[PDB]
Amino acid sequence: NFMLNQPHSVSESPGKTVTISCTRSSGNIDSNYVQWYQQRPGSAPITVIYEDNQRPSGVPDRFAGSIDRSSNSASLTISGLKTEDEADYYCQSYDARNVVFGGGTRLTVLGQPKAAPSVTLFPPSSEELQANKATLVCLISDFYPGAVTVAWKADSSPVKAGVETTTPSKQSNNKYAASSYLSLTPEQWKSHKSYSCQVTHEGSTVEKTVAPTEC
């Protein structure tokens, strides 16, 4: 089926306006209806828009949907942001019989200053290498909002196998931390010139690289 691609996160201060996009990978956006769901972590999804731009009763006119055929995208626009609007937002449409969801966008309503993450990338330690493990760790700390994406590369190529990233955790300084680890074997590690960890926060991507050494 086609895919619906949404940004991983958006943020704004109370009272401002924010927009979330939902781009269809193949086919036309207008050939099936787009719904938007709001979900607060721990609760069920709630419909805030159906049929591209219709609002259910109980949903304030601060929420508006639209379609842009020449970006092949749908958008949800929330004006007059309130702290209760902080949630995950999912766009949803159909491919033939099949429901397709976007990946979801976390909308943070800023409750404190933005803070860029400190990123540290650690190459395999002596002890684990002697145990036939070459796990890399990308440590991500001191960030707000508490939403990040991590992407790994082997040389210049995207890595997907063997990546785990922890759920951001609020630490003693009231900012978030997480770690991404890439479980390589020693052979995998030594077969490439380098590996990189790419961390995206608030729409900007930072990168670190480590390579095999002899000691």
Place this chain on the structure above:
Amino acid sequence: NFMLNQPHSVSESPGKTVTISCTRSSGNIDSNYVQWYQQRPGSAPITVIYEDNQRPSGVPDRFAGSIDRSSNSASLTISGLKTEDEADYYCQSYDARNVVFGGGTRLTVLGQPKAAPSVTLFPPSSEELQANKATLVCLISDFYPGAVTVAWKADSSPVKAGVETTTPSKQSNNKYAASSYLSLTPEQWKSHKSYSCQVTHEGSTVEKTVAPTEC
């Protein structure tokens, strides 16, 4: 307007059969198609049943949808329970003027075995030392249940400052992962013979030690 009511939780042992009901408060259950979605906290929902009883491709045949007109209800039955099935399950139907979700059922698979953590301790990266930092990271993975305590040592002495440990999070193998990081200065790092991370899980302790490089 109608509601879809599901039980809050269901629990069962591996290999067995569980049923999740979805009762429609108003209007006939058969007047609109019922969908079922599976969701892991942090991810988009996955369709497991659509049109009451159809499985999308890639959905285990252990998942079955049914309708019971006499109790005005729909059911998801999961046979041959696997740990991979632990998730929230939502039923969903239509109002024509809305998309309505049930409240969700958390499915718990009982009797998961304890698993001791894999602990890997990393010394400061070369790159962070060139940027005047010497943060250490202790990666703690693949443990169950999802509670650890962590203590650090400088030489043989307890370290009380500079420690942060993340809230354990469930990874794609349904075991938990966390990291503890110790924010040292380069001067602190080189002033000791070693630093150690001690991870305690279910009354068993694992301790790792690293020391400044000899390179």
